[PDB]
Design an enzyme around this catalytic site. Structure first.
Site, mmCIF file in Angstrom:
data_model
loop_
_atom_site.group_PDB
_atom_site.id
_atom_site.type_symbol
_atom_site.label_atom_id
_atom_site.label_comp_id
_atom_site.label_asym_id
_atom_site.label_seq_id
_atom_site.Cartn_x
_atom_site.Cartn_y
_atom_site.Cartn_z
ATOM 1 N N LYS A 107 -15.901 7.763 -18.027
ATOM 2 C CA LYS A 107 -16.483 6.850 -18.994
ATOM 3 C C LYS A 107 -17.453 5.943 -18.262
ATOM 4 O O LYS A 107 -17.085 5.300 -17.273
ATOM 5 C CB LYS A 107 -15.412 6.019 -19.689
ATOM 6 C CG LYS A 107 -15.983 5.072 -20.730
ATOM 7 C CD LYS A 107 -16.413 5.811 -21.998
ATOM 8 C CE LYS A 107 -17.381 4.980 -22.839
ATOM 9 N NZ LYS A 107 -18.761 4.950 -22.250
ATOM 10 N N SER B 70 -19.185 -0.629 -21.267
ATOM 11 C CA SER B 70 -18.513 0.387 -22.086
ATOM 12 C C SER B 70 -17.335 1.089 -21.422
ATOM 13 O O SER B 70 -16.653 1.891 -22.081
ATOM 14 C CB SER B 70 -19.504 1.453 -22.559
ATOM 15 O OG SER B 70 -20.211 1.016 -23.716
#
Length: 264
Positions: A206, A42
């Protein structure tokens, strides 16, 4: 010395660890396996949101545009998008969901709007990243198979790419600020790099997680009164469990902080 410390950390993880640290005060960097490929999982969603913002900059997309979808579009782990099948979501809401909660359907919807994994890869080539590539959609892109170049980056390439997107001129100043705001609002990274950093540091990050014992975190860190530092961490083929892999990334964060405060 940091490289030495990272090699020791890698050894006890049983896997393959890749780290890059880019000091934006000087442009200088330190890397461990910085040029080896790792599965993004991701972490690509930060880049996806950047590509969407570039389209907004070009007048080809709007953050307030409504995207409609059905239950048939939902894939696994879609904590935000599963709630809005009836009313849809705006491009901005999808970007926020993709970055701050790692919503998978949100990423697929944005990929569709962008033109797919090849369009994301083409965007990265356009800003000077010749390495990073997206090939698949969610959830398949998280396979993380050793020797598979699909859906991979290198720690150094990703660090340079974050630098030019978040701090450079690839995006409009408004879009840059928006991307920063989304990353700083991330909710999935409390046990990873953030766990190793001083409380007074501002952090945007992230996360990524995948098969073959893969745990990743990429971040931009603003220490008080200092130019920001970009840190990318990719861990794969690791033999320890998910919580232990989180702790490995937290330890990278601690080691980096120590390196910048005690001249390593």
């Amino acid at each position: 010395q940091l490289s030495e410390q990272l090699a020791e950390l890698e050894k006890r993880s049983g896997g393959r660890l890749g780290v890059a640290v880019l000091d934006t005060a000087t442009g200088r960097r330190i890397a461990y396996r910085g040029d080896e490929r790792f599965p993004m999982c991701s972490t690509f969603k930060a880049l996806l949101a950047a590509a969407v913002l570039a389209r907004v900059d070009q007048g080809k997309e709007r953050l307030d545009r409504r995207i409609t979808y059905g239950k048939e579009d939902l894939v696994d782990y879609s904590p935000v998008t599963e709630k809005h099948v009836g009313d849809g979501m705006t491009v901005a809401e999808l970007c926020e969901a993709a970055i701050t909660l790692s919503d998978n359907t949100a990423a697929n919807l944005l990929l569709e709007a962008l033109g797919g994994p090849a369009a994301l890869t083409a965007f990265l080539r356009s800003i000077g990243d010749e390495v990073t590539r997206l090939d698949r959609w969610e959830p398949e892109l998280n396979e993380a198979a050793p020797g598979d170049p699909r859906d991979t980056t290198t720690p150094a390439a990703m660090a340079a790419t974050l630098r030019t997107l978040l701090l450079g001129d690839a995006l409009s100043p408004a879009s840059r600020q928006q991307l920063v705001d989304w990353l700083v609002a991330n909710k999935t990274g409390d046990k990873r790099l953030r766990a190793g950093l001083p409380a007074d540091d501002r952090v945007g990050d992230k996360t990524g997680t995948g098969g073959h014992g893969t745990t990743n975190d990429i971040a931009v860190i603003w220490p008080p009164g200092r130019a920001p530092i970009v840190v990318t961490v990719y861990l794969t083929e690791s033999q320890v469990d998910a919580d232990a892999r989180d702790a490995v990334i937290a330890e990278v964060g601690r080691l980096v902080v120590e390196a910048f405060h005690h001249h390593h």
